[PDB]
Write a protein that binds this ligand. Structure first.
Ligand SMILES: *[C@@H]1O[C@H](CO)[C@@H](O[C@@H]2O[C@H](CO)[C@@H](O)[C@H](O)[C@H]2NC(C)=O)[C@H](O)[C@H]1NC(C)=O
Lengths: 173, 55
């Protein structure tokens, strides 16, 4: 997609993460498991929901066809009336079809963007304290227990706390 | 329908304190019953071939 994440550098989604759209899979000594990023997921849910509600809202002043009758010597205005009705019906059908097509495309890229931002959120925290595997995964240069995993997930990673043990592990490599 | 003569019908709306005056010496098809427009609202004449006890 537009942002290179979904079906991009992260080649595939996880059947395993089920409590959200975007999230993490960690793996340490205490064990592994999936977890959804509640914040970025809720943001996306709010965005998509407002989008859906905005599309349905913008359409309340749409054209509504009315039955009208005409006789054999009113064929002209009968036809005018028909062209007018079909005219608006065709316009509004275009508007609904196009709006859905356009916002669908933006929605898929929106998810792609939320993911790429989530990856960057972690990356910008870890810096040289971890290695970019290049598949959405970061291999740590230090010990990351469950509480450390939780700090990366909630944006409270204390980079300098692990800075030294990371640096030492980088340099024997 | 067997008939070779024709009848031509007319209508008008008679406003609440107005009066309608007929004068004729023949060929007159006279009103007996008229219709009070009791409720004006938004309605329609739907052209359909169907006739359902539902809502
Ligand atoms: C239809 O009937 C009414 C009532 O008999 C007429 O209204 C009266 O009009 C006069 C003036 O011409 C007023 O001073 C009265 O008080 C009215 N009466 C009522 C009960 O409203 C009315 O003008 C008649 N219309 C026609 C076209 O003959």
């Amino acid at each position: 997609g537009l942002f290179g994440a979904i079906a991009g550098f992260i080649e595939g989604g996880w059947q395993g993460m089920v409590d959200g759209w975007y999230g993490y899979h960690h793996s340490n000594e205490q064990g592994s498991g999936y977890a959804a990023d509640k914040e970025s997921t809720q943001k996306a849910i709010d965005g998509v929901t407002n989008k859906v509600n905005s599309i349905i809202d913008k359409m309340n002043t749409q054209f509504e066809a009315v039955g009208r009758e005409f006789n054999n010597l009113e064929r002209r205005i009968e036809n005018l009336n028909k062209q007018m009705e079909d005219g608006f019906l065709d316009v509004w059908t275009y508007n609904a079809e196009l709006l859905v097509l356009m916002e669908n495309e933006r929605t898929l890229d929106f998810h792609d963007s939320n993911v790429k931002n989530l990856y960057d959120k972690v990356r910008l925290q870890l810096r040289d304290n971890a290695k970019e595997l290049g598949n959405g995964c970061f291999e740590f240069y230090h010990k990351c227990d469950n509480e450390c995993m939780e700090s990366v997930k909630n944006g409270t990673y204390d980079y300098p706390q692990y800075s030294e043990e990371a640096r030492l592990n980088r340099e024997e490599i | 329908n067997g008939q070779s003569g024709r009848m031509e019908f007319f209508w008008t709306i008679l406003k609440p304190n107005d009066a309608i005056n007929f004068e004729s010496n023949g060929n007159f098809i006279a009103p007996e019953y008229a219709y009070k427009i009791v409720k004006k609202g938004d309605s329609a004449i739907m052209k359909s071939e169907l006739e359902g006890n539902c809502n």
